[model samples]
Target chain A: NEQLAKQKGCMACHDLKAKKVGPAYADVAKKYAGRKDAVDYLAGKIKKGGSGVWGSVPMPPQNVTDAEAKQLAQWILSIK
Target chain B: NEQLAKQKGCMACHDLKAKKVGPAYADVAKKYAGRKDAVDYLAGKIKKGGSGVWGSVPMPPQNVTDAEAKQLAQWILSIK
Candidate 1:
C-alpha cells in the first residue's frame, strides 16, 4: 500500500501521520470513522478528486484503476 | 526561463497556453499584466505557492533560488 501510494505520487501531497500539502492519512481515517460507506466513498473520491473538504486547496483527480483505488482507500482507512 | 521552469518541476502542473492541473502560463501572464509589481509578486508566489485564487488546488512551495524564481517569473510574465 505504501509502495502504491508512493508509485502514484500520493506521497507528494500526503503522508501517514504528518501533513504535507494534504491531510495526513490518519486524519482521513479519523474523519470518516464509523461511516459504513467510508471505503466506497473514499475510493470514489480518490479517483474523482475533490476539494474544500480538507481545505481550500483541491486534490487533483488521480489516475488509478478502480481496483487500485479500492486498495488504496482500504489501506488508508486501516491506518491508526 | 523555460528551462528553469522545467528543471524546477513547474511543467508538472503548468503549461504555456493550456490549462493543466494549474492555469496556463499565458493566462497567468494576462491576468497579471499592467501591474507595476507583477514580476515581484509572481516571483514570490512561485517560491511560496498559494491557493484559492487559482481554484482550490494548491501549488506546493517550490525549492528554488531567489534568482531562479525571479527569472522564471519574468519569463512567465513575458508570455503573450
Candidate 2:
C-alpha cells in the first residue's frame, strides 16, 4: 500500500506520522474517528484533492485510480 | 514521446500544446530555444523536477532512469 503511495508521489507531501505538506494519515484517522462517512470522504479527497482545509497547502489531485483510492483510504483508517 | 510521457504521467500536468498544471511543451521549447545547456539541464530536471519556474504548483520528481530522462530531454527540445 505504501509502495503504491510512494509511486504516486504521496510521500512528497505526506508521511504516516509526520505532518508534511498535508496532515498525516494517522492524524486524519484520528480527526475523522467515529464519523460514518469518513471512508467515502477520504476516498474522494485522495482522488480529486481538497482546497485549503489544511491551511494554504492544497493537496494536488493524486495520481491513482478510483479503486486504488478506496483501498488506500481503508488503509489510512486502519493505521493507529 | 507521448507513450513515455503517459507512462510517467507527465500528461497529468502537461500536454504537447495544452497546459495542465505546468507549461506546454511548445512553451518550454520557446523558453529554452537555442540555449546551449538546455539538454543537460533539462535531463536533470526530468528526473528531479522543479518548482515556481513554471508556476506555483511544483513538478515532483519523475519516475525515470537517467538514460530515460536524457532521452526525454532530447525529445522535449525537438518539439516544434
Candidate 3:
C-alpha cells in the first residue's frame, strides 16, 4: 500500500517527517491519535479533496477507492 | 490576481462552483464569513501547503508572496 501510494503521487505531497507539499505523516498521526473518525474522514478526503482547516490550497482527488483511502490512512496513523 | 491564480495553477485545483479539486470560492466565503484572519491564514497556506483539515491529500506550496496570497484570499471571499 505504501509503495502504491508513492506510485500514485501521494509522495509528491506527503512525507513521514517534516513539512513537504503536505503535513508529515507523523504529524497527522499525532494529531488524530485514537480518533475513531480519523480513518473515515481521511478516506473520504483522499477521494474528494477540500480546502480550509489545513490551508488554502486544495488536494485533487486521486483515482483510488474508499477502501484504499481507509487503508492508506490506517498505515499513515501507524507510522508514529 | 484572479488571472494570476489561474496561471499559477490554483485554478487547476479549485473552482467557483461545485466541489472540484478543492472547495468552491463561494462555499469558502460562506463558511468563513466575517472572519478577520482568513486572508492571513490563506496567504501562509498558499506559501506552505499542509493537510488534515480538508482531506488526506495535501496542497503543495506555491511560489507566491504573502501579500499576493492575502490579496487572493480577499478576492476569493468577495465572490459570494
Candidate 4:
C-alpha cells in the first residue's frame, strides 16, 4: 500500500501530519471524522482532483483504478 | 532541482527507468516525440488525473500552480 501510494503520487501532497501542498492524511481523516459520505466523496475527488474547500490550489485527480481508489480511500480514512 | 523533486515526491515513482508506479520521465519525453503542446497538455493532465492513454493506472492531478507545473514539465523534458 505504501508502495502503491508512492507510485500513484499520493505522497506528493500529503504526509502523516505535515503540509506539503495538500493536507496530511491524518488531518484529512480528522477533519472529516463524522461525515457519512466522506469515503465515497473522497474516492470521487481522488479520481477528479479539484480545490477551493481546502485552499486556493486545487488537487489534481489521479488516474487510478476503481479498486485502487477504494483501497486508497479506505487507507486515508483509517489514518488516525 | 533534486530537492524539489524529492519534496514533490516525484522520486518515489520515477527512477530513470526502473518503473515503480509510472513510466520514467525519460520514457515520457521519448514517447511524446516533439508534440508542441506537450508542456501545456501535460500540465493540465498533471492536475486533471486520467487514464487509458498511458496505462490502467491513472495519474492523480496535483495541487500545483501554473508556474510549478511548467517548471516540472520543463524539468521532465530535460531529463535526457
Docking class of 4: incorrect
lDDT of each residue in A1-80, candidate 2, tens digit only: 33543575644543333113455455566678788988899889878888776456576787867786777677667755
Clashing pairs in 3: none
The number of the candidate with the highest lDDT is 1
Give the Cα-based TM-score of candidate 3 against the true structure. 0.39
What DockQ results for candidate 1?
0.03
**Residue-wise lDDT of candidate 2 within B1-80, one digit each (tens)?**
23533573534543242113455555567678799999889888768988888556787888878877777667667767
Q: What is the TM-score of chain B in candidate 3?
A: 0.67
Candidate 3 per-residue lDDT over residues B33-71, each given as its tens digit = 789888787667756876776667677776656666676
Model 2 chain B, poorest ten-residue lDDT window?
Answer: B10-19
Candidates 2 and 4, the one with greater lDDT = 2
For model 2, the DockQ equals 0.03
* Reference-based lDDT, residue B79, model 3: 60
Superposed model 2: Cα runs more than 4 Å off: A1-80, B1-19
lDDT of 4 by residue, A3-79 (tens): 43356465454332211456545656766778998888877877787789666777776776666566666766776
lDDT of 2: 0.64
Give the TM-score, chain B only, in order for the candidates. Answer: 0.73, 0.73, 0.67, 0.68
lDDT of 4 by residue, B31-64 (tens): 6758888888776776676677745767777776
lDDT of 1: 0.66
**What's the count of clashing pairs in each model shown?**
2, 0, 0, 8
| Stretches of model 1 off by over 4 angstroms after superposition | A1-80, B1-19
